[PDB]
Design a binder for this molecule. Structure first.
Ligand code: GTP
Ligand code: GDP
Ligand code: MG
Ligand code: MG
Length: 414
């Protein structure tokens, strides 16, 4: 048998709309990540998708067919049980250009990524470029490029595009990243991709002694109709543990917290609660570490957590000291051009009184620029952000031609 453990690594899946991201996650894990009504109606990813799988290797078989996602080697001709390697998970991002902020919030959770490029579309499409640039800015360097949809192009065309892709990465941080051709729809060459994931997206070193921090991307009321009172639950909060670990019965807090009134002004009250349960996928655990997206059960009234109310928050231990800032100072750099547009425009300098969008951890916040210097801006935010460490990365977006567009990045200075 294989052990039941939490996933130990998060692999982003990014790329242009309809290039095959969600189908690729299904080919690997068996799971369709889209769970929302609007996603099914429109045939598109809107919220961050998620799926897990075990990975193992059949020691008697040849590679890449030796790599498997279930405890059997019958496919490669062996009756032996495969050796368990690790459990992995996928953060399936939307490719729609209007959903870039959602992609950026998912990128904060990624240990590595697969950039999916459709073989039957011109390269590089706007969000192929834009997601590539985002990965570079955020530092998600452990990249595999997957050339998808090879089932509907000639070998000549696939090879031509392959050369284009290598030339695109030439002279960049990604010069040496592998390109793996597959068909996500017909599950062709998926074994090679799993081998690639093992070689190129290793589980990173973690630090379990650091103060526990979870970035929140989901929150739920898990109570369903037709159930007895004796199995009703308090609010559940979902996200990624980025450092340290959490345990059942631990006293925790959600930051910035709840928007309330205090002294005729808007304030955020930290939400204190206790961990009642920990789940990854369909499995319960007593503790949670980095890797995978965890569901933290609490004793909170489920009205506080319903419908992703706490998206963008962080969770820490109750006694942790974490800055919660309404005004932030950012040491910044600007991109040369707006990469996500069908036409690349030059990026104008930041000016005082501009309203910008700031991506910090899993949070997305608008704010007004109160001060501009050569490499430093100060921003008055519409809602405060939890800044759990010095020199946290922020991505800066500006509204250009009716769309939020990534224009730069920086470090939040505390
Ligand atoms: N022929 C062929 N079609 C594919 C392949 N992979 C995906 N598709 C099709 O491409 C369309 C888009 O697939 P999705 O998986 O929804 O693509 P996506 O990148 O997740 O789209 P968004 O999340 O909205 O950005 C669907 O019709 C798929 O069936 C493939 O390998 N070959
Ligand atoms: N920690 C914890 N997580 C839960 C509990 N019940 C549900 N979840 C998680 O909360 C998320 C929402 O689940 P739900 O609304 O029931 O949809 P479902 O996963 O399809 O059953 C899922 O990822 C569950 O794994 C619980 O009692 N404790
Ligand atoms: Mg679609
Ligand atoms: Mg999708």
């Amino acid at each position: 048998a294989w052990p039941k453990v939490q996933p130990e690594v998060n692999i982003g899946v990014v790329g242009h709309v309809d290039h095959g991201k969600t189908t690729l996650v299904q080919a690997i894990t068996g799971i369709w990540t889209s769970k929302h009504s609007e996603e099914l109606k429109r045939g598109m990813t809107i919220k961050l998708g998620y799926a897990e799988t075990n990975i193992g290797v059949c020691e008697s078989c040849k590679k890449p067919e030796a790599y498997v996602t279930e405890p059997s080697c019958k496919s490669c001709g062996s009756d032996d049980e495969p050796k368990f390697l690790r459990r992995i998970s996928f953060i399936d991002a939307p490719g729609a250009e209007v959903l870039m902020a959602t992609m950026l919030s998912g990128a904060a959770l990624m240990d590595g990524a697969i950039l999916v490029v459709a073989a039957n579309e011109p390269f590089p499409q706007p969000q192929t470029r834009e997601h590539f640039v985002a990965l570079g800015i955020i530092g998600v360097k452990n990249l595999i490029i997957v050339q998808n949809k090879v089932d509907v192009v000639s070998k000549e065309e696939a090879l031509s595009q392959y050369r284009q892709i290598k030339q695109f990465t030439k002279g960049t941080w990604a010069e040496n990243v592998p390109i793996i051709p597959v068909s996500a729809l017909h599950k062709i060459n998926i074994d090679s991709l799993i081998e690639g994931i093992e070689e190129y997206i290793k589980t990173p070193y973690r630090d379990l002694s650091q103060k526990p921090v979870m970035l929140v991307i989901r929150s739920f009321d898990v109570n369903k109709p037709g159930t007895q009172f004796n199995e009703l639950k308090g609010g559940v909060i979902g996200g990624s543990i980025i450092q340290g670990l959490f345990k059942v019965d631990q006293e925790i807090k959600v930051l910035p917290g709840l928007r309330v009134e205090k002294q005729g002004k808007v304030s955020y009250e930290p939400i204190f609660t206790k961990i009642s349960s920990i789940r990854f996928g369909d499995e319960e655990f007593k503790e949670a570490k980095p890797g995978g997206l965890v569901a933290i059960g609490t004793y909170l009234d489920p009205s506080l957590t319903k419908a992703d109310n706490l998206l963008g928050s962080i969770i820490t231990l109750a006694d942790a000291e974490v800055p919660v800032l309404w005004n932030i100072r950012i040491k910044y750099n600007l991109l040369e051009r707006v990469v996500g547009a069908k036409e690349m425009l030059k990026v104008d300098p930041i000016r005082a009184k501009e309203t910008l969008m700031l991506s910090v951890g899993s949070s997305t916040t608008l704010g007004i620029v109160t001060s501009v210097k050569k490499d430093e801006i100060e921003v008055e935010l519409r809602r405060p952000v939890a800044v759990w460490s010095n020199n946290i990365r922020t991505v800066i977006s500006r509204q250009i031609a009716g769309r939020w567009r990534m224009i730069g990045w920086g470090l939040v200075e505390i």
